[PDB]
Amino acid sequence: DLEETGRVLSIGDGIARVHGLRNVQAEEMVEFSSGLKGMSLNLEPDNVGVVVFGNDKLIKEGDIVKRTGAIVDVPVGEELLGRVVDALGNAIDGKGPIGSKARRRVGLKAPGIIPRISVREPMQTGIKAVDSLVPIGRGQRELIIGDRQTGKTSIAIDTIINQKRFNDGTDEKKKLYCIYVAIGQKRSTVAQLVKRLTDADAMKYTIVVSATASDAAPLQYLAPYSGCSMGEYFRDNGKHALIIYDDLSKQAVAYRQMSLLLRRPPGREAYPGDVFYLHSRLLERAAKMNDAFGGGSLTALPVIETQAGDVSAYIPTNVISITDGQIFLETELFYKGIRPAINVGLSVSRVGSAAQTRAMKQVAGTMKLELAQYREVAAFAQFGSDLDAATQQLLSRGVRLTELLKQGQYSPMAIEEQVAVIYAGVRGYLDKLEPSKITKFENAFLSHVISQHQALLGKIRTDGKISEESDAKLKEIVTNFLAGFEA
Template sequence: MEYTIVVAETADSPATLQNLAPYTGAALAEYFMYRERNTLIIYDDLSKQAQAYRQMSLLLRRPPGREAYPGDVFYLHSRLLERAAKSSSSLGEGSMTALPIVETQSGDVSAYIPTNVISITDGQIFLFADLFNAGIRPTINVGISVSKVGSAAQIKAMKQVAGKLKLELAQFVELEAFAQFASDLDKTTQNQLARGQRLHELLKQSQSDPLAVEEQITTIYTGANGYLDSIELGQVKKFLEEEKRLRLGSQKDELGGAKAPEIVKKIHEDEESEEVVDTLKMGIEKPEEEGCEEQVEIEDIDL
């Protein structure tokens, strides 16, 4: 909290103060931005600000629109979020990054305020309560969560392995909804559902446990290419931990004869190279051969 400023207006505060609180925070962030600092401002949350603004507008007898919000509620948020910027070199190259949070009712992302904010921002991360209750954390709904930046922010190695992951997850979501009403599923559908469950399992992340990019790449490649299909669902995390130990521990960070950071570097040197995928495959198959006894032991664990 040493570099943090909190501007708070609670639920019992007047609507006028709740409406002004985000602008106060933005003014403080701009103060540091123009002094060559990089700032991050988090609005928690803009739904409550919109409700306070609606309350004020109705008291002022302004004509209500959709969901009783006034007609200029879009401008309320657009002028706030457009204050986030990157200063030019003449102004010190400071920056202000805005991270707005919006509440959804029963997961309805098509409501008035969520759609307004989504249309302003560069994408959204949609957190789904049902996923949280199912034990999937972070509770990110990959179908609704999108980014206008997309894979342009990813390194080439991540693009190659993540593309298949996104396709597999999208197919799994569709099949999962269909499987709830079907009693007899063919073998191919069952295999796709089983793989999707394992992909969800490998995407679960422990609290305060970040992964290096090379670890992310190899983990995603392991699941998306079927190396977890024969592993029991409850043992996926243990298998990945053992695979990581063999690959990064006993192998001294060697991945198919090359260190993981070197593999990531290779793909940048040759944009058309497919060497990274082949090398990752070697790195995963090598622990499978050398650590077969350890992996059998994992599979025999009764959870």
Template sequence: MEFSPRAAELTTLLESRISNFYTNFQVDEIGRVVSVGDGNARVYGLNEIQAGEMVEFASGVKGIALNLENKNVGIVVFGSDTAIKEGDLVKRTGSIVDVPAGKAMLRRVVDALGVPIDGRGALSDHERRRVEVKAPGIIERKYVHEPMQTGLKAVDSLVPIGRGQRELIIGDRQTGKTAIAIDTILNQKQMNSRSTSESETLYCVYVAIGQKCLTVAQLVQILLEANAMEYSILVAATASDPAPLQFLAPYSGCALGEYFRDNGMHALIILPPLRILLLCNFWPRILDDLSKQSVAYRQMSLLLRRPLGREAFPGDVFYLHSRLLERAAKRLDQTGAGSLTALPVIETQAGDVSAYIPTNVIPITDGQICSKTELFYRRIRPAINVGLSVSRVGSAAQLKTMKQVCGSSKLELAQLRLLEVDNRVVVPAKSHLRIAGPPPPTNNRYHHSRQS
């Protein structure tokens, strides 16, 4: 049977209409809450979810998928879980956790998700950057050769830090570790005022974890009085925030610093999870250690029933810090020559650097600044133990004039310490006690620095 011309035209018309038929369907994968409690939830039905993907509960609370199991997904909740109930719907967002980034973030205080908490309104003119990104590869990096001046003579002369370096600050509590980091931010005011272009300015990102809201406000006040907030960003995950936000805060701060690094500028990120105790003269003494983030991560892992390792930390706690600190780098000239410098801070117990977290972080970093309790009590500030402190970049991160002046300073200071020990004469007394003579006066010209 042959088709008539009219039937052929109708067939062609139908075929063209069918081939051009298009409907934009939006399919959302929905799951249901199996159990909830202690800031985490188990959800059934999200079979295609990605690791680290954001989800949204029926109550509007958001979370992040950390455990991908055969039958359900372990999700940590960003906020209170009191409004989440068993059987509630959970929807995938299809996006990995990201935060706003850009120069609009300067002079602002934000939480771990990049939401302003300083009461100055919403952000404007910014881009979004993923919190978890891959660190620059070997080919994309350049050797560290530019000095990152801290303004502290003891650091710049004996343990120089370069732009793009990762220098660990480690020591016992109340030995002035984080004071070194805060003084570094304050001292950038004078150095940035002498810069002639944005490529010479150093922007600072300060991550505050586990401290009270009052102490965050006091820290902001200190930076405002010194006009240091003009080039600074403060990321705060306070003590009232859940463990997932405290875990996420360092990565959010690193994403903010990477904006400057990838756009040919220089940034400094300080990673002390903080607890601030007030001392005199309105200057906070900060007791800090990078293990605060590890504790939050351990809490989440225990609730998600992950296998445990040494000191009850999960097995991937080394990767937790390595993937964070490896993002600090000096980029090639072809990619803008930007840099991101990291100053993580760790607290030791009785000078023991062989604990789990210190032994994890020391191999990742490019050197460490060790503070000593004895020097601190002798009012040598900053209380840097020159014998244990080292910078693996060394004189490559110093100006030529600084090399000439301070080339032999570390050796001379070590000889001075040795002579000081030898001059502690012990004389016999009538009793069984031995009386040690007073130590000779020490030369503190390398250790003089302002610290209240």
């Protein structure tokens, strides 16, 4: 055949004015002379502006443009879990052909109202600060914001790793498919990263969609959408999928770029405007769905890595307006050594309670406050030096909690454990301790509660809540054990 074939009307720069194919379906994935796909994104009447998917040095002009005649699909499956692919589903891991050889349109629309359901599942990350201060739900789309490797990713890692146990738990409500859409994260970055997940083999329920820095832009752009169909799939199949889009920031960069090369605009900040829309449509596809959809979820953890905390920054403003909070991670703290380095004032979950255990809620509620207040006397009068004696204690309390909300570099947890140390501080047994040693207290304390109070924990774990047993034991434990920790 060569009749719904076309000749490359002009090419250079991977911007193919495409002669022919004049019956072309909009957004048809097209098929190359170079084999390759392209997208007939632009139907101009006299050409098809074809975004060339991948390298074009190969390419030359008048070259035959073939329909693929397909609007893009991506292979879909759970056989993406334990696979590093590029978005077309190409093993770059060298793990060979994916079990995911079902395919699914990468665009599949976002849920209905009734189809959706609100969240009320928690979820967690193994990070005290997180689960406490940003208790996690399921079916999300909420902003992760922070700058790069610091183990920026650590944050995510401990979460993914944290889901391991949950994947060692059951339900899609413990078990979780993690989807790491890596947008523009170099081969190295990934190389390393993947290397980690694998090591944690939290990878097992986990897709790593790997779009490294090298990759062509639409591809990278696409990578999430690719993921998107797959995660909705999981969602609709009851599966609760977690996508970490790290990051759309880069995605935009590509997307505009692509646009520009198509001469398709550079809106505010050089990005054309429906990149919001881009994502909106993308992200609405992340939801916690009702049971007709298996109840599943696609929890979206979009990531934006900020340049200098630039957030009124278009895409960030945009994103903010979709997201239901942002989790700001704070650098100064980092330098202080405080990793996680948060500013939780600038981390918000409007959501709050749908996202958590009672256990935590009970100890944390107050804690948030105790720090808040602590901060406040650092702040009204922008001095860490005090304004009232009461608070000279309270500040101690705050300070203690400060030691506690940290999270070890390369370390997740689970909720009862988390609560364990938290209760200890919240209900205070360690302001009768120096703040640096609090964490130290935990090492022992934790290894103790793990040892002993796995029983007790058995209860807390059971209740999702601190119970009378647990508590009663706790009050006692903490005091006694603490007493043992010290003396």
